[PDB]
Design an enzyme around this catalytic site. Structure first.
Site, PDB file in Angstrom:
ATOM      1  N   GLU A  75       5.157 -13.675 -20.654  1.00  0.00           N
ATOM      2  CA  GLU A  75       4.508 -13.210 -22.079  1.00  0.00           C
ATOM      3  C   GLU A  75       3.649 -12.027 -21.808  1.00  0.00           C
ATOM      4  O   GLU A  75       3.395 -11.042 -22.786  1.00  0.00           O
ATOM      5  CB  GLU A  75       3.567 -14.349 -22.702  1.00  0.00           C
TER       6      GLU A  75
ATOM      7  N   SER B  81       0.827  -1.165  -0.017  1.00  0.00           N
ATOM      8  CA  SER B  81      -0.069  -0.133  -0.012  1.00  0.00           C
ATOM      9  C   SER B  81       0.804   1.345   0.093  1.00  0.00           C
ATOM     10  O   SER B  81       1.675   1.377   0.848  1.00  0.00           O
ATOM     11  CB  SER B  81      -0.759  -0.047   1.148  1.00  0.00           C
TER      12      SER B  81
END
Ligand SMILES: Nc1nc2c(ncn2[C@@H]2O[C@H](COP(=O)(O)OP(=O)(O)OP(=O)(O)O)[C@@H](O)[C@H]2O)c(=O)[nH]1
Ligand SMILES: Nc1nc2c(ncn2[C@@H]2O[C@H](COP(=O)(O)OP(=O)(O)OP(=O)(O)O)[C@@H](O)[C@H]2O)c(=O)[nH]1
Ligand SMILES: Nc1nc2c(ncn2[C@@H]2O[C@H](COP(=O)(O)OP(=O)(O)O)[C@@H](O)[C@H]2O)c(=O)[nH]1
Ligand SMILES: [Mg+2]
Ligand SMILES: [Mg+2]
Lengths: 430, 439, 52, 369, 431
Positions: B254, B140
């Site tokens: 990928e 965060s």
């Protein structure tokens, strides 16, 4: 004699193979576990075309599965007829190509070829006499176009007197499956044109165009498009295995298809094709096959054939049929479209007859022809490539593995030169 | 043979990372107490679930995660709940004193006594794996404690390992909602650390999430519990292909090479749909066409921004369900012809099509209901400039009179750091404009 | 405590739409199917590989 | 969704090795998938096939892709939970007094919802006759009953079905044969029984008792042998589709009425190595040679032996033309025209010549065993 | 492969919408719950894959009372869970309020809702939109809806079944204003508009149905059938099909005049209906009777330019043309000079359905007429005068200016109303 080996790279090449071998297998009636169960002696006569022998009497296919990632390789095995493959010949990587052409040709793929280059060597010399190579691979994928093209280039130097075929599925313009589609395709042709004895373009777009307008189906699957090709691939090599009026090995198809040294690309179209409910009403006469087989919509490529002229035409009539009717249909069609046939090569249609028809039908034809229509498919790729390079977008990955900007420029130069030279003869007159 | 190491740092990241394990655990078929269900002990012969679990040689499947937090309260909550019996006992390293939103404290003063153990945990997990694909790190940006530790790990990881891919599921400051009073500061400095070390950064601003829940789910009083699941559901969408049979698989190795046009730009904003409450779900067929059309709708954008305000660079969306590949072809064709959404000039094609055969599994008793067809999207469109610009503007006001800068000066954090940090955000902002200009 | 009760909890739902955090709009339809099961969607006919 | 797993083993032929798999079953959409116990790799990638819910029970077999594989036992506990109550096993037999009605009695069994899993016919022997009734030895009627057991052919069959044993019992009716007709005339006993000791049939009452009678008459090592007479005979095999279509009783009953003396019949489950060779003779005719031998492998199939005077000619005169589609037009009363539906599933099959038939009938009952 | 979307706005429009749905629901074989007790019905509905169906409708309004009745009655399961967009405050017949102060912040959700439905369908044929001008909110929201509808889509046809105020019986006190501003907007956007004023309706039921205490429940019913009569050709087999697209080319003489008046017959109660044959000759005879005009206009007071009448029932075609010959011969109905043949015959087969507990009785034949009449100028004539008188001393004017509208807007409406009257007089002059 005159046997061939099978090598495939990338999942696009491997997936296709899953059907061809299952497509081819049925013709001879070989059961999955390698026990012959056919009807006719003709069924076994040319088991040497694609198979071999081993102790125990169970047959085995000569294939070479080459790729860099386990996802594709681990899948094809479990499919029906997947037990025929020799697990020894399996070769696979561990990292993955990530669709980077430079990654699959120099950085990673180049390391694993030695193992794959080893397997190919034994089969080639281990047969009675090697006729050529047939390979299925994708020009649109990083692992295929990169590692796949590496295999051919090395192979050609070793066996100067052999022929080779490549059934590449070039990526259509409207639908793109890899954001790096332009680069991995433009570079691929550069190496392919120099050494690839043959290459015919098949468009996935055409695959979808043919199904929804002829078969009359509702929802195709990846197998549906795959099934046709595997049947198609047999078409070129169909007449090399069965007796017929005019036998024609793979080379003979070479002699009457490539008028000049460089223009060596082909397109195909399969017929006849009738739908589930339209399977009975249509009448089967030799003239019936001709209309669709030269029909524009039947061409298995996205490029429109009517936008150019046919440099040469080839046709492989399948099954028993009157010899004259095969010719009389061919010449008439040759004159009825005299404008669309280039005028300086008389008698620009070849014919063949194979007496054993594919199971399930009574007469069929496979179309192969080099036509100025294939010009568009490069131009469409050419236009896309020029757009990205100016802004060097999507370039850091490729340049980070040793590639240099000039090599990319050189590849384009050859790419455009082929297109320009191809239209050189379109306006040529005698 | 593909594995991925999960790392969670910071409270808010801790809770979000908490939910995902409930979604992942439910999806595969593992019971709460680690040992497979007695009914189907050996039912799952296929080793599909290796993507997130490692066999113990005899027994349960240990989660491939390491939980970190410098305050014991939240973590101690984890080690007392019903999942106490799942995680490895000696991998949840907890500290003594909280960072107190003092970024200088979380990076230069206290963190130096706990970073080492975190690195040691990272190494041992890898050795068991053989094919590390990449790193997924949750953190965060709005909390100082997470920011300092979050920045350190990536820099340390980038040098220890090298070229392995790195991804981050941050949660930046909302355009108008706020949590702390110093979020503008800790956010800008953190962006510096993550800019030159991460290949991809995702946008999950919490302000939009509340808006997303109300419009469809029909819940008028949403809490942190509802927000956590959606991200957990989002995570499964991108990682679904690596652990299920797929007609067209996409690898995390990928993903990297199809979303980042240039070395610097490594952000993007995600969206998910459909999300229809079971009360009003089954009234629609959930067609492939409509789901995609709603996919680009401004309202459903998980990140509070307006894509109409800019152009699109490249969007890679993976579907999940029983979609027909032609139908997938059906959806895209319509999108491009549209005029309201325009791509960048230099990218004629920008779609990466993905399909899968494993649909989502619904967490019992939740707001979500089961649906056959689902799709996840993450696009890198010029719209992201608004959040970076909005964060930057807020920075100028405070620094006008060095308000609140004295405490950060109190932890060895050099004064000039703000001078150097400010430039990079400004440099990044000018980067977006240059890329978008037509040729 | 003088707390409200579920007997009164529903009434407040109908009056002013005042709920508790993380709870859903219950309309109490007549489900012929079980909400927990049944995938709440439409299926378009898809046979096996038809090209066979 | 909801899964049931049955570990399976396949008997390959390349070598003596044998292997086991899991043969999973998705009841959600009738998909098939399999996984092997050695090397822990995926084997079958969850494809579609033809497996029927009633053909999956312990002790049964079903073909997939020219491979003969059969269940072994329960795989996970989850599976033994659901099937613990359903899928019993109870055996049935028919006394020789009902020989001239054997086909009919078989008729009602299928319609009831059970399954005809196994079937055999043999001639009991005196020595084992007393062993047949081990508990009734002392009763006054035990000796007399045993004397009658050695009269004439016995038809044997195993009944498998949901709560089969109790369903079978309520089908017979009351114990005494006389009382049945007054109260239950819709039972086998209300139509055929003659006297108290000539009860139409005797069945299995208790699961503890049900086990023994099943092994004693269907074990790999039994004292009862086939009684097939190999002289002046012709053979016929009922094609599988009749069993899947539930008319096998009709086919059998049809040939009994003609006065034929039905001699021997025992079930046979067969695979490709023993399928092609039997039809291998037709290699030069019936261009459908592959299919007819192929379809012969899928599903159970009965084997029959018939003999009246002229095994082939007299029977073939009612066997009729090989093409059922044309049998109806010119042969309405013949056998197949009532059941044949197409070329490759033409019901009953008859050999070609009288002089050649004998070896055909000898194949099933002499060597294949 | 052909679909039509339904748009409803305003309390009368909402209530009028409800009436048409009971007839449609009970016509095709679907129970109110939405399930089917075991391809034509596609024309109005859609299939969600399993079980019930979702009607293709959208409801807009600013007051929740009327709509909140729907989500609490017996038709709660049917309509889309969220498509019943509901606001918070009431416009209160301040026509301005519904167009520049409160309508702007809610029309947005409307446009999106129509956007979604158009995607799912494939054969979008046209839009049928109901809206009452006698009320402020129904007016302002409707006006903007049609304005955005045309520009967003283009050439797709539109239909509007408005409800103007009665000649002498009045509902509100500001009807003269909101009525005038309605026509101006609808004049250039709605291809076809059917006048359906109330004061004829009360004359319709009482004269025939013998119902001395008709109530708004019954009034909405009549329009429910007419929608059934007009749309019937699209969802049943027929020997002559006339599509919705095939109206603008058989009813509009010029680009400006695009208004027709409706009428229905026969209407008779089951207690008194079954003592006459109901021959085609009389049924067509009753069609043109001045008593029966669904809208309050006198046919004897003007020309006729075109009248397309759709039979529906078992009527044999042969009786059709002969009846037309009967009409053309009477000297008391004179057609416009330049139009020789003024009929477009349509025929269907499915007999009309009867809803339980209704007033109409099952008839074997019926006729529904939708024809432009030169008389329609009477309402504009009467309404135009009313606006002039009350605007003389700016009565009520000080409020409408209170919602942002300019003074100049009102004046331009007066000129436009003048233009429409001028054209109608011109069309009537013989050559
Ligand atoms: N997505 C999500 N974000 C949260 C949640 N709770 C807090 N946050 C965000 O986290 C920021 C503060 O950091 P946290 O991670 O919550 O707490 P922390 O990691 O201990 O950091 P510190 O508060 O500085 O100690 C706040 O500004 C919130 O925006 C939550 O439940 N879900
Ligand atoms: N035919 C018919 N018309 C109705 C009915 N109810 C209302 N109306 C029409 O509605 C007009 C008055 O407006 P409202 O019904 O209050 O609804 P509105 O036009 O949208 O204006 P609002 O009052 O703001 O809602 C009247 O002049 C009627 O013409 C009805 O039940 N039947
Ligand atoms: N027709 C068809 N094409 C396929 C199939 N699978 C992959 N492709 C093609 O392969 C291309 C992408 O291949 P890619 O994912 O890069 O293979 P990889 O590089 O080995 O992972 C797409 O353009 C597809 O057209 C299939 O099952 N059928
Ligand atoms: Mg904290
Ligand atoms: Mg109102």
């Amino acid at each position: 004699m005159r046997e061939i080996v099978h090598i495939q790279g990338g999942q696009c090449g491997n997936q296709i193979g899953a059907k061809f071998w299952e497509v081819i297998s049925d013709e001879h009636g070989i059961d999955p576990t390698g026990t012959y169960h056919g009807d006719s002696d003709l069924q076994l006569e040319r088991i040497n075309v694609y198979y071999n022998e081993a102790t125990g009497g169970r047959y085995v296919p000569r294939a070479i599965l080459m790729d860099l990632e386990p996802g594709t390789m681990d899948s094809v095995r479990a499919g029906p007829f997947g037990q025929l493959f020799r697990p020894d010949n399996f070769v696979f990587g561990q990292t993955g190509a990530g669709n980077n052409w430079a990654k699959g040709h120099y950085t990673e793929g180049a390391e694993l070829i030695d193992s794959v280059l080893d397997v190919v060597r034994k089969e080639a010399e281990g047969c009675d006499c090697l006729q050529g190579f047939q390979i299925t691979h994708s020009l649109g994928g990083g692992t295929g176009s990169g590692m796949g093209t590496l295999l051919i280039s090395k192979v050609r130097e070793e066996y100067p007197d052999r022929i080779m075929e490549t059934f590449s599925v070039v990526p259509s313009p409207k639908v793109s499956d890899t954001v790096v589609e332009p680069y991995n395709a433009t570079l691929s042709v550069h190496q392919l044109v120099e050494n690839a004895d043959e290459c015919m373009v098949i468009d996935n777009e055409a695959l979808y165009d043919i199904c929804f307008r002829t078969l009359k189906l509702t929802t195709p699957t990846y197998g549906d498009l795959n099934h046709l090709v595997s049947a198609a691939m047999s078409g070129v090599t169909c007449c090399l295995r069965f007796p017929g009026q005019l036998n024609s090995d793979l080379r003979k198809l070479a002699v009457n298809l490539i008028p000049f040294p460089r223009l060596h690309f082909f397109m195909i179209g399969f017929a006849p094709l009738t739908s589930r409910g339209s399977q009975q009403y249509r009448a089967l006469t030799v003239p019936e096959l001709t209309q669709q087989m030269f029909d524009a919509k039947n061409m298995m490529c996205a490029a429109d054939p009517r936008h150019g002229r046919y440099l040469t035409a080839s046709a492989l009539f399948r099954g028993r049929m009157s010899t004259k009717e095969v010719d009389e249909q061919m010449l008439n069609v040759q004159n009825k479209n005299s404008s669309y046939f280039v005028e300086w090569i008389p008698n620009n249609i070849k014919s063949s007859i194979c007496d054993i028809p594919p199971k399930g039908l009574k007469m069929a034809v496979t179309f192969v022809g080099n036509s100025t229509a294939i010009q568009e498919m490069f131009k469409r790729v050419a236009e896309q490539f020029t757009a990205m390079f100016r802004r060097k977008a999507f370039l850091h990955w490729y340049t980070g593995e040793g590639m240099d900007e000039m090599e990319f420029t050189e590849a384009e130069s050859n790419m455009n030169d082929l297109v320009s030279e191809y239209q050189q003869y379109q306006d040529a007159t005698a | 043979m593909r594995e991925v190491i999960s790392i969670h740092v910071g409270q808010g990241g801790i809770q979000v990372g908490n939910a995902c394990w409930e979604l992942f655990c439910l999806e595969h078929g593992i019971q709460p107490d680690g040992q497979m269900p007695s009914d189907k002990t050996i039912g799952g012969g296929d080793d599909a679930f290796n993507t997130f679990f490692s066999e113990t040689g005899a027994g349960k499947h240990v989660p491939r995660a390491v939980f970190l937090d410098l305050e014991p309260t939240v973590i101690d909550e984890v080690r007392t709940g019903t999942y106490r019996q799942l995680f490895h006992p000696e991998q949840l390293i907890s500290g003594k004193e909280d960072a107190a939103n003092n970024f200088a404290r979380g990076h230069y003063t206290i963190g130096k006594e706990i970073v080492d153990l975190c690195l040691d945990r990272i190494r041992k997990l890898a050795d068991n794996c053989t094919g590390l694909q990449g790193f997924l790190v949750f953190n965060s940006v709005g909390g100082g404690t997470g920011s300092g530790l979050g920045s350190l790990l990536l820099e340390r990881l980038s040098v220890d390992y090298g070229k392995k891919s790195k991804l981050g599921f941050t949660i930046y400051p909302s355009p108008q909602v706020s949590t702390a009073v110093v979020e503008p500061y800790n956010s800008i400095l953190s962006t510096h650390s993550l800019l030159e070390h991460t290949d991809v950064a995702v946008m999950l601003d919490n302000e939009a999430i509340y808006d997303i829940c109300r419009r469809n789910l029909d819940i008028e009083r949403p809490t942190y519990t509802n927000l956590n699941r959606l991200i957990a559901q989002v995570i499964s969408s991108l990682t679904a292909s690596l652990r299920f049979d797929g007609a067209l698989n996409v690898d995390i190795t990928e993903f990297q090479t199809n979303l980042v046009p240039y070395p610097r730009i490594h952000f993007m904003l995600s969206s998910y749909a459909p999300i229809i409450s079971a009360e009003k779900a089954y009234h629609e067929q959930l067609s492939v066409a409509e789901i995609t059309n709603s996919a680009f709708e401004p309202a459903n954008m998980m990140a509070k921004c307006d894509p109409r305000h800019g152009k699109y660079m490249a969007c890679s969306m993976m579907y999940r369900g029983d979609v027909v590949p032609k139908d997938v072809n059906a959806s895209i064709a319509t999108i491009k012809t549209k005029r309201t959404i325009q791509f960048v000039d230099w990218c004629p094609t920008g779609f990466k099509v993905g399909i899968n055969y494993q649909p989502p599994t619904v967490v019992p008793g939740g707001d979500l209901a089961k649906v056959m067809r689902a799709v996840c999207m993450i696009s890198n469109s010029t719209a992201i400039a608004e959040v970076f610009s909005r964060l930057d503007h807020k920075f100028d006001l405070m620094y006008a009179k060095r308000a609140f800068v004295h405490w950060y000066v109190g932890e060895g954090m050099e004064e000039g750091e703000f001078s150097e940090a400010r430039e990079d955000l400004a440099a990044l902002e000018k980067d977006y404009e240059e890329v978008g200009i037509e040729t | 405590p003088a707390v409200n009760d579920q007997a009164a909890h529903d009434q407040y739902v109908r009056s002013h739409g005042n709920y508790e955090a993380g709870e859903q709009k219950n309309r109490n339809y007549n489900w012929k199917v079980d909400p927990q099961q049944h995938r709440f969607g439409k299926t378009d006919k898809i046979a096996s590989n038809e090209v066979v | 969704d909801i899964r049931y797993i049955f570990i399976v083993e396949w008997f390959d032929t390349a070598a003596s090795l044998i292997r086991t798999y899991y043969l999973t079953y998705f009841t959600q959409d009738k998909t098939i998938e399999m996984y092997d116990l050695k090397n822990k790799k995926v084997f079958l990638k969850r494809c579609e096939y033809a497996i029927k819910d009633s053909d999956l029970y312990i002790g049964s077999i079903l073909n997939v892709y020219s491979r003969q594989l059969k269940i072994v036992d329960f795989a996970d506990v989850f599976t033994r939970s659901k099937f613990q109550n359903i899928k019993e096993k109870t055996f049935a037999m028919i006394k020789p007094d009902a020989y001239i009605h054997i086909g009919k009695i078989i008729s009602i069994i299928e319609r009831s919802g059970l399954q005809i899993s196994n079937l055999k016919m043999t001639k009991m022997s005196q020595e084992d006759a007393r062993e047949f009734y081990g508990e009734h030895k002392g009763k006054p009627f035990y000796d007399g009953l045993v004397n009658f057991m050695s009269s004439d052919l016995i038809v044997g069959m195993e009944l498998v079905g949901d709560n089969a044993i109790k369903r079978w019992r309520e089908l017979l009716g009351p114990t005494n044969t006389l009382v049945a007709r007054e109260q239950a005339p819709n039972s086998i006993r209300g139509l055929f029984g003659t006297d108290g000791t000539r009860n139409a049939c005797h069945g299995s009452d208790s699961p503890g008792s049900a086990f023994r009678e099943l092994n004693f008459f269907f074990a790999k090592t039994s004292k009862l042998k086939t009684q097939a007479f190999f002289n002046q005979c012709t053979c016929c095999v009922i094609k599988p589709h009749i069993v899947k279509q539930n008319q096998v009783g009709e086919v059998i009953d049809m040939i009994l009425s003609e006065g034929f003396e039905i001699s021997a019949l025992q079930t046979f489950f067969l695979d490709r190595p023993t399928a092609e060779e039997f039809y291998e003779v037709y290699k030069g005719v019936l261009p459908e040679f592959n299919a007819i031998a192929e379809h012969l492998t899928s599903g159970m199939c009965y084997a029959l032996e018939v003999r009246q005077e002229n095994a082939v000619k007299s029977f073939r005169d009612i066997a009729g033309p090989h093409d059922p589609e044309i049998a109806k037009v010119i042969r309405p009363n013949t056998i197949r025209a009532r059941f044949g539906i197409d070329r490759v599933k033409n019901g009953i099959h008859c050999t070609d010549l009288e002089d050649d038939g004998v070896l055909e009938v000898e194949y099933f009952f002499n060597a294949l065993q």
